[PDB]
Structure formats: C-alpha cells, structure tokens
Write a protein that binds this ligand. Sequence first.
Ligand SMILES: O=C1NC(=O)c2c1c(-c1ccccc1)cc1[nH]c3ccc(O)cc3c21
Ligand code: NA
Length: 276
Amino acid sequence: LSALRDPAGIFELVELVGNGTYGQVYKGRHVKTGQLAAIKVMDVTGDEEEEIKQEINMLKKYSHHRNIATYYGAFIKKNGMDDQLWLVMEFCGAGSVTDLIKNTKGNTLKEEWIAYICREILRGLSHLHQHKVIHRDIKGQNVLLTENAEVKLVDFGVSAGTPYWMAPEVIAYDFKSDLWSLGITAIEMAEGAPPLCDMHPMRALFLIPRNPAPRLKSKKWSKKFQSFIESCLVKNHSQRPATEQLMKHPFIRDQPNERQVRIQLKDHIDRTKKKR
Ligand SMILES: O=C1NC(=O)c2c1c(-c1ccccc1)cc1[nH]c3ccc(O)cc3c21
Ligand code: NA
C-alpha cells in the first residue's frame, strides 16, 4: 500500500555510497536513535509501481536472515519534481567485495578469506532457496561487508547489461544458476575480475554457453579451491550440485580460522578507513 509516511524527521540522508544496477544508494541516519541505514532513493512514477511493490514484498518476507541485509521500512518523499521512494535497509559499512578486491594489493584475496565469504554467500543463498527464491544477480558488487566483517547479500531488483556472472542456462532454469554466479564471484575474488571481463557483453553472452566451464588461471591455488570452482561451474545445471551439497564441500566445510579470518578482514577494513 503506497500510502506510506514522509521520511522528514525520521530518516536523513548523509552521503551517497552506491551507484550500480540497484540505483542511487545513500548512507542514511535514523534521527531519534542515530543508527545508520542504507537508503535507496528511487523516483516513483505512474508506470513504474508494480516492480517497486514486488521488491518491497520480497525484502519484507525474505531479508530476515543474518547473511541478507535487513529491510527496515519504506517512505515516500512528497515533492514538476516527481515523488521519491526511500527503501530503508541494514547498513554495511565496509562496502562491497568488489571494493575489497580493488583496495587489496595485487587485486586478489587470500584463499582463506574467499572460503569465509563463499560460505556466508552460500548460507544466505540456502535461506533464499529454502523459500523458493532465486537471487538472479550474485556478484561481488551485491555481496557486502559490515564494519565487523559480517557478509550480507543485497539487490532483489532482478529477483523481482553485464552477463559475466550469468549461468549458461539463463542465457539459453532454477536455484542452481545462483551457484554458477557464486563460482564466478569466487574467481572474481581470486583473479580480481570475472572470466571474459575484457570482452564486450555481446561476445560474453555468445561465449558463455559455448566455451567450457571456466577455471583459475594460476597454479598457486589449492586443490580444494580448484575442486570447489569446478563443482560450482558445471555447464549442465542438472549435474550441478545443490546449495546444501556445496556447503558440505571441503573448501566450505573445512575453515578452521572462522574467528581468525574475520579478525584479519576486520583489520584490513580498519586500514582502509584510517589510511585516507
Ligand atoms: O541494502 C543495502 N544495504 C547496504 O548496505 C547497501 C544496500 C544496497 C541496496 C539497497 C536496496 C536495494 C538494492 C541494493 C546497495 C548498497 N550499495 C552500497 C555501497 C557501499 C556500502 O558500504 C553499502 C551499500 C549498499
Ligand atoms: Na537480515
């Protein structure tokens, strides 16, 4: 019901943080408590109304898992200047996995960090898949980190371009397509960019269903990580493992430093804020 409250006196915009496939996202502040939130500001027209209402319902029902940024509420800023809808979400201070790769020296993440991040994406995906929901847009831009290095999934717009993370069956499907995208995100974390990044999106769209399943370029990566990527990236989706199966894989299952990897990531986050 689009008869929502005006945000005036409740939530205030502080700084713009996001500008991707999800739109114009701001770092907002709750006036009375001083708590931070992510506010997505979108122009509410006559035509575009059905797509916005579907995104809200998805968030209201499915965002209540620890690996998905929580929905806090929605507001309409009444205004020649069209009315704006404010989508209030849980704030993830450390930014995206894409930013984490860009800030790390040599644009590659430590294998132990990849395993932690992948496990958290997989847990969030498991929650969505249990509720018969496909994310449809898994990529480093959509995987965010909190200041305490907690991993949260964002953007349910596509759930309600850049084909680099798209599974062959999607280009040609079910929950298994998100697991292909996780594999591509894992390579993105390992190599700094997804396979076929250097090519035009049209060539990538043509090549993905035709080329054999991608693999890691370097021989430096562990046999466990190499097998994980191979398990994720199975072109024939019928033969690709489910979410619960992939969670049981040694790369995800055997992570002894869950406490010591989180502390390392938090220290890397703190070094980025302190140094400029
Ligand atoms: O929900 C969010 N929580 C967030 O923290 C957040 C969200 C979104 C986003 C919000 C609504 C719809 C789609 C994406 C985009 C975002 N871009 C961002 C860029 C940097 C950042 O630190 C946080 C976000 C961010
Ligand atoms: Na949540």
